[PDB]
């Protein structure tokens, strides 16, 4: 189990770790988060008490270094940093644990929620979507726009998701216009899976990462990307049987985890109604359709 120590908590902030969150008061003796499960990516995110605008946070993997948080009073945010002196870091952490000034990552033993949300998410792929190569961790916030959004303005601070556009020369073979537009299998399997992503694990990883940025930061272009990657599968007549089964599981846990009160904005009525009731794969998402109909029957 790993640890993300905090230098201090100078400003009142709600701190999130994965799907957990807790309130820290201004100048409360908080010095970080312990017992973080190794083997998964994680995200630690922040919303200031004073300005609910700008949720922001850091994707990280504790196997890739020793990381800590320290407030910056000039830039006004909790920053993630790497400590390269490992003896210094162990000593700092051990002191903070002895004085019990850390919250414990509160994973219930029965609980596979985080695993199921991050199954295919790799830190190495995150870092290609979020370009900031000097750091091992990746910053995201509410306002970051996607590469495709900028096509329709600062490139260094963009989310470089894979561009998907159903009315593009990439999606549509000359001579197969009606075929390729009504049955996107060519685009999914040849262009995207074989051409760009290489395998469905990398595809599902981007999809899961887009959902999580949408949910934790209300990042609107992430939500667009999540829905686009769902729709491309559902609108393909020919999808590997194992991909459909795994998609159903993926979506099931995203819908289960979504806050009930955020459904109105984070869920696109047209994509979901199409995918569950009209698409080629309308009969292939049994778990997702059952939880959708029992939790958000209004959207449908």
């Amino acid at each position: 189990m790993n640890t993300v120590p905090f230098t201090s908590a100078p400003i009142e902030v709600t701190i999130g770790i994965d799907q957990y969150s807790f309130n820290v008061k201004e100048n409360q003796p908080f010095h970080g988060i312990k017992d973080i499960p190794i083997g998964h990516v994680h995200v630690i995110h922040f919303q200031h008490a004073d300005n609910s605008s700008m949720r922001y946070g850091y994707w990280f993997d504790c196997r890739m270094g020793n990381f800590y948080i320290q407030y910056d009073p000039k830039d006004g945010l909790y920053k993630m940093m790497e400590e390269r002196d490992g003896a210094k870091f162990e000593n700092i952490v051990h002191n903070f644990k002895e004085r019990q000034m850390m919250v414990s990552y509160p994973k219930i033993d029965e609980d596979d929620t985080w695993y199921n949300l991050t199954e295919f998410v790799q830190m190495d792929k995150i870092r290609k979507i979020v370009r900031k190569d000097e750091n091992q961790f990746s910053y995201v916030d509410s306002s970051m726009t996607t590469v495709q959004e900028n096509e329709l303005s600062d490139p260094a601070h963009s989310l470089n998701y894979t561009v998907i556009n159903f009315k593009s020369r990439e999606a549509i073979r000359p001579g197969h216009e009606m075929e390729d537009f009504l049955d996107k299998s060519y685009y999914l399997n040849t262009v995207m899976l074989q051409g760009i992503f290489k395998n469905s694990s990398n595809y599902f990883g981007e999809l899961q990462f887009a959902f999580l940025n949408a949910m934790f930061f209300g990042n609107y272009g992430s939500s667009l990307q999540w829905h686009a990657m769902i729709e491309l599968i559902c609108s393909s007549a020919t999808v590997p049987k194992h991909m459909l089964d795994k998609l159903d599981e993926i979506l099931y846990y995203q819908i289960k985890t979504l806050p009930e009160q955020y459904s109105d904005i984070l869920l696109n009525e047209r994509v979901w109604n199409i995918c569950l009731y009209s698409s080629f794969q309308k009969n292939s998402l049994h778990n997702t359709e059952k939880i959708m109909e029992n939790k958000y029957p209004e959207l449908l």
Binding site: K167, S168, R169, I172, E177, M178, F181
Partner: protein, 237 residues
């Protein structure tokens, strides 16, 4: 965006544009089978593609063979329309290609957009006008060429005959839409109006009779009466 009353004179500016109407592409008669079931039999159709400024009508005849062995023909008809419009544009010299194409039914937007991805600078637009171009098959010579065709065929007509020698394209379009609206509301009466006087003939290379200016005002007045009337007989007013 959408074409409507507020931007109606754009049609007659000097930016090349085409209206595309697909309402006569896929045409059927419905009948009973020997077993007493119902079946359709396709008949020849046409794409109605019209330059409103010049009166140029590129009439692409859709021969029934194009449907043979195909499924979901009403959906296929929109993509076949799109493929043929795209082929037409590609066949024109660059300086003759349209800058906008206006589809009379919104279901043509995606098929046309997809077929025209090679032409990002051609705007594909819908319209809020309820234009009467379905009545094109009530023009005798157009109906005649469609029904006689034994193979796919493109036929090039001026739908304004020689009108532009005397009137503007705005006035020519208004006359055309009035004639077509009349033919759509009551074909028999409309045609009676247009032909009742044997002395006014249709030139061999024209679609409509050779009315003088004064005769056109009479005709146009009679067509308005018809449309208001039939609106009477229809709503009882």
């Amino acid at each position: 965006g959408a074409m409507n009353s507020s931007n109606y004179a754009e049609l007659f500016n000097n930016d090349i544009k085409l209206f595309v109407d697909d309402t006569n592409v896929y045409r059927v008669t419905v009948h009973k089978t020997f077993e007493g079931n119902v079946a359709t039999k396709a008949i020849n159709g046409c794409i109605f593609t019209l330059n409103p400024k010049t009166g140029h009508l590129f009439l692409k005849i859709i021969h029934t063979s194009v449907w043979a062995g195909q499924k979901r023909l009403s959906q296929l008809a929109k993509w076949k329309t799109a493929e043929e419009v795209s082929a037409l544009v590609r066949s024109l010299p660059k300086e003759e290609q349209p800058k906008q194409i206006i589809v009379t039914r919104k279901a043509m937007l995606d098929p046309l957009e997809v077929h025209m991805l090679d032409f990002p600078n051609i705007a594909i637009r819908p319209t809020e006008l309820r234009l009467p171009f379905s009545a094109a098959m009530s023009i005798d010579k157009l109906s005649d060429v469609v029904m006689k065709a034994t193979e796919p065929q493109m036929v090039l007509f001026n739908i304004y005959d020689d009108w532009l020698d005397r009137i503007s394209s705005y006035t020519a379009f208004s006359r055309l839409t009035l004639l077509l609206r009349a033919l759509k509301t009551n074909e028999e009466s409309a045609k009676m109006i247009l032909l009742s006087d044997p002395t006014i003939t249709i030139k061999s290379y024209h679609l409509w009779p050779s009315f003088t200016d004064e005769q056109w005002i009479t005709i146009e007045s009679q067509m308005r009466d018809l449309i208001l009337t039939e609106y009477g007989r229809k709503y009882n007013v």
